[PDB]
Amino acid sequence: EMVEANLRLVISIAKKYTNRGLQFLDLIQEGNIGLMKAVDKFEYRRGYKFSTYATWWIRQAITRSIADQARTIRIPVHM
DNA sequence: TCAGGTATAGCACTGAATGACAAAACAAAATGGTCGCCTGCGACTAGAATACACTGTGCTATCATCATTAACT
C-alpha cells in the first residue's frame, strides 16, 4: 500500500530528474527500489515527513545507477 | 763408375700436458611478504506527489493480408 501510494512521488522525482541516461524506465525502477529500501527502514517517530527521506534515498539510488550503469565501460562512483 | 758424406726419416725413453668427476659461487627466475590505493556498501530526517519526456516522418508508388460493415439469402 505504501509503495502504491508513493509511486506518484517516485514518478514526480523522475520527472524532476529528467535525464536521458539509459532510459526513463530504468530510472523509474531504480527509484522504486530506493523507495522500497527506504520503507524497509523508515519510522514515523522522527515526527518529520516521509517525502524528504524517500527523496534522499531515490536520489542516492539514481546517482549509484547513473555512476555504475548507463555507460559502456564501468566507472566507479568516486571517479 | 764405385764410394765418403751430409741431408732427411724412423726408433728408445721419462716426464710434463690433457680428461673426467665433483664442489663452491654468481646471476636469472619464480614464489612469498608487505605497503598504499581502488573499490563495495551504508547513511544524510524542513517540504518537495502523472508533467516531464517532448514531435518532425512530412501526404512517394503502388501491392498484397487481416477483421468490422452492409446486405443477399
Numbering used by the authors: 378 to 456
The authors write:
Transcription activator RamA is linked to multidrug resistance of Klebsiella pneumoniae through controlling genes that encode efflux pumps (acrA) and porin‐regulating antisense RNA (micF). RamA acts as a class I activator on acrA and class II activator on micF, respectively. AraC family proteins are highly conserved small proteins that contain two helix‐turn‐helix (HTH) motifs and bind to a degenerate consensus sequence called marbox with considerable overlap in the genes they control. In order to provide the molecular and structural basis for RamA's roles in activating transcription, cryo electron microscopy (cryoEM) single‐particle reconstruction was used to study the structures of RamA‐RNAP‐σ 70 ‐acrAB (class I activator)/micF (class II activator) promoter complex.
The structure of RamA‐class II activator complex at the micF promoter has an overall resolution of 4.0 Å. There is extra density further upstream of ‐35, which shows clear density for DNA, including major and minor grooves and density that could account for RamA and α‐CTD (boxed regions). In order to obtain molecular details of RamA interactions, MarA‐DNA crystal structure was used to generate a homology model of RamA‐DNA using Phyre2 due to their high sequence conservation (46% sequence identity). Indeed, the RamA‐DNA structural model could be fitted convincingly into the density, including accurate positioning of secondary structures and those of DNA. In this structural model, RamA binds at promoter centered around ‐35 and ‐45 with one HTH domain binding to the groove of the ‐35 element, just upstream from the σ 70 R4 (σR4). There is still extra density that could accommodate an α‐CTD, upstream of and contacting RamA as well as DNA at ‐55 position. By lowering the display threshold, the electron density map suggests that this α‐CTD most likely is connected to α1‐NTD of RNAP (thus is α1‐CTD) although resolution is insufficient to confirm this. Each monomer within the TAP dimer interacts with either σR4 or α1‐CTD, while the RamA monomer instead uses the two HTH domains to contact σR4 and α1‐CTD respectively. The interaction surfaces between RamA and α‐CTD and between RamA and σR4 are relatively small (≈60 Å2 and ≈100 Å2 respectively) and are mainly polar interactions in nature, as confirmed by the structural model. For micF class‐II promoter, the transcription activities of RamA H31D, RamA Y75R/D76R/D84R and RamA H31D/Y75R/D76R/D84R all decreased significantly compared with RamA WT (P < 0.0001).
